[PDB]
Amino acid sequence: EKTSDYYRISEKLPVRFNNPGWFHGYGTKEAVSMYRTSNQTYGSRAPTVHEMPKVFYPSSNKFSRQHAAFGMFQSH
Amino acid sequence: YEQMKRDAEIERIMMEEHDRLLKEESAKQERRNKERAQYYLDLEKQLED
Amino acid sequence: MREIVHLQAGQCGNQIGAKFWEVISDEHGIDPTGTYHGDSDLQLERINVYYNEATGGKYVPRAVLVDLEPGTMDSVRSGPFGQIFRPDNFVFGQSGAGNNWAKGHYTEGAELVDSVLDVVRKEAESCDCLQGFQLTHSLGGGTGSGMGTLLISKIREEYPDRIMNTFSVVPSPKVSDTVVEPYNATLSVHQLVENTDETYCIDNEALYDICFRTLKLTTPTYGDLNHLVSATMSGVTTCLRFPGQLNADLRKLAVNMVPFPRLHFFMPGFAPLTSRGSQQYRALTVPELTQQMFDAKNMMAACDPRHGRYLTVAAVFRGRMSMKEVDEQMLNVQNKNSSYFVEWIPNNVKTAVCDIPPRGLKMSATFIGNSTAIQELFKRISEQFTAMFRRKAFLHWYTGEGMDEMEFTEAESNMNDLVSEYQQYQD
């Protein structure tokens, strides 16, 4: 249940993608019934340790917000 | 030479106080995070009620 | 006292220019924290051409980095040398140009151009005497070509007697990577022929043939093509910072070069570019450096200049060399080849030497050629614009916010003459 153990990783990946057991909201593998509708097949299984992204390159914006708060520089 | 040495000492002092400012800002940010965790906890308690 | 300011434009310029400060700071000996730890003694003697002072003896580079998307500024700040830039000097919008030259000239970028100039007037106030500004952009996209032009025509009007210099990524002929390229490139040369004192043509297809045939690389990524341009921008202005014999500044290379004031589109090249297998095999001598300058492979623009005459030719050598081997070796070019040279200038060559080589080489040069073959990519850009504009292929994305259509057939009026002006001076 620990993806740095199974796969190598880039060490800056967050703990959500590191530990896959916390995604508790998915379906719970009900044994099949006849009244099994087909659109419910979307998102029917939780992600496992194999499907987590190896690397992650998101776009931070904290510095851009904390600089462009207010207005840009102008000589008065 | 004496004036140059005084300049170097005073500049090192001000960078020490700036490092103090950096550490207190990180402390305040972690305090805000623990406040957020506390709010999440007792909202879950109310849902259980 | 002669110092310059290094503006960076667009997202292509922020890959060039962020690699430009990791080459200058290698040369001047600055750590990523901004404190001098260097070897020699004249190395920081002319540190003030580019850099600036702060409290406590730390050096900050001067620049201004523009963009229309906030993603690039976080990427520059997380770079290897990204710590030294001032956080006030980054300026950026909130909504991207979307490869639209008209958005980046009228509606999305004009909110920003009143805020870049407040940074520029703050950096140009601090000078002893400005040698001239400097800009880095791309002639293929929207926010480099629109707003990066709108910086130029407003800086030039309010600083009229400074030596404006640019560095342009000219779009490729056919190996291209944007559908709406010729609307973006023909609408920028219309405002780049009348407002720049020198402008450099950097093909992205001659920058791959270098990286296959004379360097013999395996996976040429963008990390080193920014470096090949960033060795030429350091190489032109080495005479500005460091001493030597026959120095030639950023301005005295302009006076000798452009014979008529609309023909300032150059083609550069860097002289020792040697494969890592053949580093053992190149011979360090001045004539062997010269055959690389005039070789047709190390041309770094899109047209081979054997299809016409050079008008004026530069050569800014660097290192320790006898200046008889400099001034004889250029003469042996003008006599072995004679039909490839304009015959109403009796000497087509400007030379220069300085005594401080690049880090890790004995000697290096920087070729500059004002060839008359540069009309050829002006025809191929204009022919891919007069096929789109026969039946208005993509025009409604540009017209709908305030650009009328006559500023597109005005562009080819200011473009199809410049094809002809190289032809009447061809012979």
Add this chain to the structure above:
Amino acid sequence: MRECISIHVGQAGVQIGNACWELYCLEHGIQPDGQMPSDKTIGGGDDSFNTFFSETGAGKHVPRAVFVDLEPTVIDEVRTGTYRQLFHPEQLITGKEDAANNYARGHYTIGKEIIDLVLDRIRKLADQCTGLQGFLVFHSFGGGTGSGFTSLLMERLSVDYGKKSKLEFSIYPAPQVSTAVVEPYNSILTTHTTLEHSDCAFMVDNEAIYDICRRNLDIERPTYTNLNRLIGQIVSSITASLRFDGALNVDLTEFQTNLVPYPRIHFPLATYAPVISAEKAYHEQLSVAEITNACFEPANQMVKCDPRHGKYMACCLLYRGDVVPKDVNAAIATIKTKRTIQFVDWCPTGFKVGINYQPPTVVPGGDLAKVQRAVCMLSNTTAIAEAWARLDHKFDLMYAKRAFVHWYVGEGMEEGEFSEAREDMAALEKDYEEVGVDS
């Protein structure tokens, strides 16, 4: 900061959104109940979820999406399924009684009671966050609320927002494979708003996805779950350059101006090239120059129209993974070498190229494989003109005998709107002709 809002309409569009929000949740670390699962472990360098999630006060991420349906049964599988603890319960908007394969119900008489709700819930979402690159809606042509309320949503959403971009995703009827006799009557008459009020309207046929699975993959009898997983890997490739940085990145503004020549030619195609069974990915190479030659194959398109009959106006290429920029430029000039691949006489440039460093992620239980490389080839093509030529013929054949008309005309629809839609698509069969001949 660089966000998007995903508005889902109808029974087809909701079951796309069951597949997308499964797959964005796997791409970040987010569990199906929010809860970024880091527990007292330090981390730095993040905020790649601002484009599709919102970090709230409790530390729980809630996405920006409204789910609109006129049917109760489809959405209430989400309210009781695994992702019930993820969506905000005001954002699963539910209708009361359905449109039942009717433009006139979905646009004139049933969506009037519900349009006041959705335009309040969208304005709550957008006022919340800084910028807006653009909405990404999902619908279907062949149904009532999928094409009625969608035709009423887009007329109202282009007024009060305007300059913020839009996208549009469609389910387009096949030549052979149909599910309703109302299918031509509403796939002709939905174009009075997807022409005026859409900035890019992507096109996906059910029939080629029914055929691309039997030939590339070792799968037979594929159901609707396998159609949703494939189109989830397109929307997670168009928007991948917003989140995960790259050497050459295109935003939503960037490929809009490189792909539509004139403002009535916004009907591009899309293809996903390295589709391969997970047994077969062990076998072949799937190189950097292999998967770009596959984008132009007639067997691996998305709408069943022959690509060897039209001329390509523009192409945008969206690469993903470990791609070097020299190998891209070796690929493109090879395509212009071959002379059975046709480009229009006023476009020598041809291409727009994007590259992201993030590899294409895998989904558990998915028949797609794990491959280091991927590309999604966008193209605007004259061959889609021959795709309405099997729908105008199925409309006037219907309309002459006036079959199935009395339902529409009794609900506030006038008979002057039927034949007005037929000329407005027979006009567009000349707009895709007049830019075809050479000069």
Add this chain to the structure above:
Amino acid sequence: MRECISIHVGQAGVQIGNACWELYCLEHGIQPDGQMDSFNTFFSETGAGKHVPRAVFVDLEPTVIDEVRTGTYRQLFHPEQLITGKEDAANNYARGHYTIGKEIIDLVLDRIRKLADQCTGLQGFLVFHSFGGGTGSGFTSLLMERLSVDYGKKSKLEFSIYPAPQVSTAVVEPYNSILTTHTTLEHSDCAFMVDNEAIYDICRRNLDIERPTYTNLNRLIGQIVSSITASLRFDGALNVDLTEFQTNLVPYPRIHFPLATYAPVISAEKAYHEQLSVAEITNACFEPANQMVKCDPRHGKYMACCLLYRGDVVPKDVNAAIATIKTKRTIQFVDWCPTGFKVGINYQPPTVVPGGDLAKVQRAVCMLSNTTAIAEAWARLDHKFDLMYAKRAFVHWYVGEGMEEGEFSEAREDMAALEKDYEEVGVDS
């Protein structure tokens, strides 16, 4: 030192005081048996460690007092504070004013004397009543007239429930609600107005609850009262006083009818997903579907606003919220009030009752406004007065208990005077 004394008149006042004193006793540490420096505003303290409040409960039905005696707060009150009459007023202003109230008005004013001499210096009474019933109109009116003449400059706060447009129970409600105002207008130094239909719609719409009872309504009223007087009890950055916001709030000496609004009335379900910023709730309390009296503010010019923020607020954000409220071009303001607003900020968050249906909110706002929108919420009462009194129904009971026929008309011209004051102060300049 800054104390206040509460009088609860009638069944509406008794049940509002129920919800109140549960909320205050859980807000401080005090258990209901009185056993545990901020209680001195409301709680007298004995030498043992019992806390006893400054409250007087008075009703004429014995039942509405002795279920307060039977219920679990019997230990708190001195058992002589709980005062009981013999017959109820039977929805009759005249009968509650005359035939029952004279028997125990002496006892309630003597308890007022005995409690108000057990303090240092008074700040303001808080009496609770409603404008629908007999004793809660008339005995309230006699009480407030006598207390105002007897004390003079000592400020009082009357709390009132108005009869709603379509939510009503009795039939003599226009009669007693127009006959209360004539001598309950000019002796109260302030009075506040709510109605049941607005609270019903806020419970139905904002909170995810259908079908509420009077318990939830009294919980909301207790939240608003606690929001007013927490600046007395608990200290903070910008605490305002009673005299402070009276002078800031009342423009003219018969326009003393502020509204009430309390902004984050949202369940735990919506509170968990939604962020809540102070600019967001500053707009949300000026939303014209969140007020607490059914008058549309779009018909109304705002003479004055005073905001009461509680919790994790900082002043720059409240100031930016004020600027972005005046920036809008859909909210009307008075042509001779350039300043507009008054701000208070407390340092203690709202305290949550167990079993209540609210959520614990880090930043709350209680908004008060003196607006001209409320003027069109009297013409409905005057028209119902006309429809009754023209053919003269239900007058003979009130005049058999004792009156003359001209006093209702005196109340009618009093409401005409109030209508013309609210019309003339709102126009242009």
